Design a binder for these strands. Structure first.
Lengths: 89, 92
DNA sequence: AATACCACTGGCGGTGATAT
DNA sequence: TATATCACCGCCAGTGGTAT
């Protein structure tokens, strides 16, 4: 698969690190998160591990489950989500 | 590969509301489907497919087109506007 | 367990030409 | 023209099976 960009790989590392810090307090695993995003565990592993790119919807759903802001792992997707909101206001 | 899914009733109605706005506003704003395609970085058949309900709007596209046509997304697509506000709830 | 690896495919979001 | 509607398909996110 084409490598993702270094910024995209950094967002995936910040995202997975939050999951490792919060997984026991929030009672999570890759398969339960898979279920909440209606996806499979290997679909989640690919996002956590910088194999498949994060998009604005997946990131927004993961930020909600993990109780963090999107900007905590992806400043650029958070930038994007804010631009689109300028169009609904 | 070949596959394309048919749009839903809702996606067709959004498309139909977006083309209407464009027709109501194109020369007051000085727009054609190829100026718009250029604005959006694609060709006139790309825009053609969106206005004519062949390809479905996504949130990024719907937000660029809203800004350019100076409407809010909800004027042609409440469900994408609701989807965009649900994403915003995660950055605020 | 819980997660990672790997080959694979559906459909997203287009393209250019041509017909109207 | 300006638009609509062909035929066409690259690409990669997500899969599901299996291994660690």
């Amino acid at each position: 698969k084409k490598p993702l960009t270094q910024e995209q790989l950094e967002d995936a590392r910040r995202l997975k690190a939050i999951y490792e810090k919060k997984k026991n307090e929030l009672g999570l695993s890759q398969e339960s998160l898979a279920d909440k995003l209606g996806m499979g565990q290997s679909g989640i592993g690919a996002l956590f591990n910088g194999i498949n790119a994060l998009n604005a919807y997946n990131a927004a759903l993961l930020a909600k489950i993990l109780k963090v802001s999107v900007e905590e792992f992806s400043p650029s997707i958070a930038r994007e989500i804010y631009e689109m909101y300028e169009a609904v206001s």
